[PDB]
Amino acid sequence: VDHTKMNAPAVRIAKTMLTPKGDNITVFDLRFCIPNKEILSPKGIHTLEHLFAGFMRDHLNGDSIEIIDISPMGCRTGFYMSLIGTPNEQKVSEAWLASMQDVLGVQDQASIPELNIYQCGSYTEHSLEDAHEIAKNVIARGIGVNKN
Amino acid sequence: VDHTKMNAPAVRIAKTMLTPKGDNITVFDLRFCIPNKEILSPKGIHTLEHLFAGFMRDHLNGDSIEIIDISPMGCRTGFYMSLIGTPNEQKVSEAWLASMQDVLGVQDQASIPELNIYQCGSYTEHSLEDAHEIAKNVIARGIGVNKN
Ligand SMILES: [Hg+2]
Ligand SMILES: [Hg+2]
Ligand SMILES: [Zn+2]
Ligand SMILES: [Zn+2]
Known part of the structure; x- marks a missing residue:
């Protein structure tokens, strides 16, 4: 899709596909930054990821939506979010x-549950600070829409 | 899950989903590096991200397999791949x-047509070198397996 055409921050129905029987799997382009104009930090996006899916499962992931997974994009310009349902x-x-x-409600690293050699893939690649700025940006800038 | 005991390269199973209608969803931890011992290049996973995802489906997904999203993790040591089915x-x-x-069939960056600023949200960030790098290292180590 034309990354120059799209805007951010903005939700966008990334793809829609049905299950063999009947259920629905919707996949969302949770694009935080403006394609090639800005970019997420390998540490920020990472500490963020942890919190995001822990919280999106709180506000979204209710009873007629199911979250499979939320993970950052390689291009570090937002996350992809596949889910069971179709908001x-x-x-x-x-x-x-x-x-x-x-996310903002997490003042320090010992609040991020995983964050350890024993449970997080790469213990020293976390920046609660960078991951808070992002919140500030997004919360500040407002989350519009991007339709195909 | 104790990362410390994990082995890489290795396919681990991290999640199976039961959708109301019946069909089961599957989420796979695809671990390239030993956590906190070895990790992926930011510019390389992206590069390896436009490749992998496609090629995969060209060797997977069928009369009972459908991949939703192959996407990089934040820690940068692996790869989750969600699908409808149960392989x-x-x-x-x-x-x-x-x-x-x-991956090693990939001649050069001039083989990635998607590398435009209208189709890549971070086409600058790129390293087919490290693709091949990561690649040849995987095809030498042989993928193993981990059991939760
Ligand atoms: Hg941004
Ligand atoms: Hg590795
Ligand atoms: Zn982690
Ligand atoms: Zn890209």
Whole structure:
């Protein structure tokens, strides 16, 4: 898709596909930054990821939506979020804008549960600071929409 | 999960989903590096991200397999791959291998047409060198397997 055309921060129905039986799997482009104009930090995006899916599962992931997974994009310009169900751009965003407020509520590293050799893949690649700025940005800038 | 006991390269199974209608979703931890011992290049996982995902599906997904999203983790030591269906370790540990050799089928960056600023949200960030790097290292170590 034309990354020059799209804007950020903005939800976007990334792809839609059905299950063999009946259930629905929707996949969202949770694009934080403006394609090639800005970029997420390998540490920020990482400490963030932890918190994001812990919180998006709180505001979103209710009873008629199911979260499979939320993980950062290689291009570190936002996360991809596959889920069981099919919310719309409003519903996700509202869930995203909330979460960021949830992230802010974490003053230090010992609050991030995983963050250790025994449970986090790469213990020293965490920046709660960078991951808070992002929240601030997003929360500040507002989460619009990007339709295909 | 105790990362310390984990082995890489190796396919681990991190999640299976039961959707109301029946069909089961599967999420696979694809671990390239030993956590906190070895890790992936930021510019390289991206590069390896446009490759892998495609090639994979060209050796996987069928009359019972459908991949939703192959995406890099934050820690940067592995790769989660969600799909509708239920293929096991050997069936993922094998096409990742078919998927790895093809990385080395990649001649140069001038083989990635998606490397435009209208299709890549971070086309600058790129390293087919480290693709091949990571690649040849995987095809030498042979993918193993981990059991939660
Ligand atoms: Hg940004
Ligand atoms: Hg590695
Ligand atoms: Zn981690
Ligand atoms: Zn890209």
